[PDB]
């Protein structure tokens, strides 16, 4: 109890404290053999998280790393398997049985806890991110079996809380899965969790639109500024996984990256939201068309949006801010992949009016950005920056091989960046075998 308390209060220390776990899922899992029981005591964790204490209190630090050591005894126990990377998987009647049983408890114990938890930690986002990670393991039938819709709407009230709060992209990312796992996967419940989700979007579209507005009539102000891009934000996270073509985004995007191309002032993370945005409803708009049994008129329509956007996608290249050439960049090589004759497989010949070449200024452009902020002259930060413009040039090399941009000045490219490796490398290889 208070026991078991002190266990994973040390647990928690040694976790912290030492350099022998790197990774909070390799500790449970290489404690797991040996004090499943322990680790599986969640009601004397969301007590330690929860209760006020007496004498001595946890950190903020211990308090984090609780929660990110429950959370993966939570995986570990529904999936009943080692983590991702601990792997090597058939499963006995009792270890079968075991599996079922937790995902009861967790299940029940999380209904409850978790809205409790979220609130009191909420401010917090590194871990209201983690809580968010919880209802994924969920037996989400539970939510009618137990009469326990008190506790869903208590979900719900806490996961709007946060989005309101919050604009960290971890954050709302978080809340915008969450939001999907309680919809899709048990119909008792999607309507009343559908009803919640685009009561919170149409407040956030509402305030989006009269912040475009602010913005564009007007001299503008910080307020106009983080209006549209606070807004934006929620709503750009939540557009990759949810459908809200219902609301009319691209076209206020549409606006603000017109007005940052025509006079050059439009905020950097705007213009890159604005940009990711518009990206997800043309997804959207594509989904519903290939789907559906689409129309002369509704392909037309797609592809002068489609073409309206590639045309802001090209302009931005230009934009000052590295951040905004990598995200147009990004969404270059992106929609000329989709939009390329790729589309036409699958008896979907219907498609051909949405088929886009880019042309010789746009291929060209395409291979400058490449020169410049692909292959570049000069801690943590860089090695994550290196992989960034791996993922660049990794899209890029898609349209290279399907002869969508000039192979040949690519290749040209490669030649001149890889030269020194030719010219001196078999020399330096060889070198540096003897030592």
Known sequence: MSPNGNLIRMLVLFFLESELHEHAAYLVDSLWESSQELLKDWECMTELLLEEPVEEAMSDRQESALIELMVCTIRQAAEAHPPVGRGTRVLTAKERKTQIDDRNKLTEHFIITLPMLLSKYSAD??????????PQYFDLEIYSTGRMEKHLDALLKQIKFVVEKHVESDVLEA?????????????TIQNRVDIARSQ????????????????????????????????????????????????????????????????????????????????????????????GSPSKEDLLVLRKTVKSFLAVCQQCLSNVNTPVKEQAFMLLCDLLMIFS????????????????????????????????????????????????????????????????????????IFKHYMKYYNDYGDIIKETLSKT
């Not at 986002?125 to 919880?134: G, W």
């Not at 915008?176 to 048990?186: H, P, V, W």
């Not at 890159?272 to 997804?283: G, K, N």
């Open 125 to 134: 986002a590194e871990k209201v991110a983690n809580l968010l990670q919880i």
């Open 200 to 291: 919170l979007i149409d407040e956030f579209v509402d305030r989006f639109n009269h912040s475009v507005e602010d913005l564009l009539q007007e001299e503008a102000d910080d307020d106009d500024i983080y209006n549209v891009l606070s807004t934006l934000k929620r709503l750009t996270s939540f557009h990759n996984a949810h459908d809200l073509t219902k609301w009319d985004l691209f076209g206020n995007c549409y606006r603000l990256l017109k007005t940052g191309i025509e006079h050059g002032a439009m905020p950097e993370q705007i213009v890159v939201q604005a940009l990711q945005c518009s990206h997800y409803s043309i997804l959207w708009q594509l989904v519903k068309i290939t789907d």
């Open 341 to 412: 004759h790729q589309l036409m497989t699958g008896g979907r010949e219907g498609l051909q009016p949405l088929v886009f070449n880019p042309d010789t200024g746009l291929q060209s452009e395409l291979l400058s950005f490449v020169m410049d902020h692909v292959f570049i002259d000069q801690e943590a930060n860089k090695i994550e920056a290196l992989h960034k413009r791996r993922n660049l040039l990794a899209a890029f090399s898609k349209l290279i091989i399907y002869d969508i941009v000039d192979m040949h000045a690519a290749a040209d």
């Open 175 to 187: 809340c915008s899965k969450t939001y999907s796992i309680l919809c899709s996967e048990e119909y």
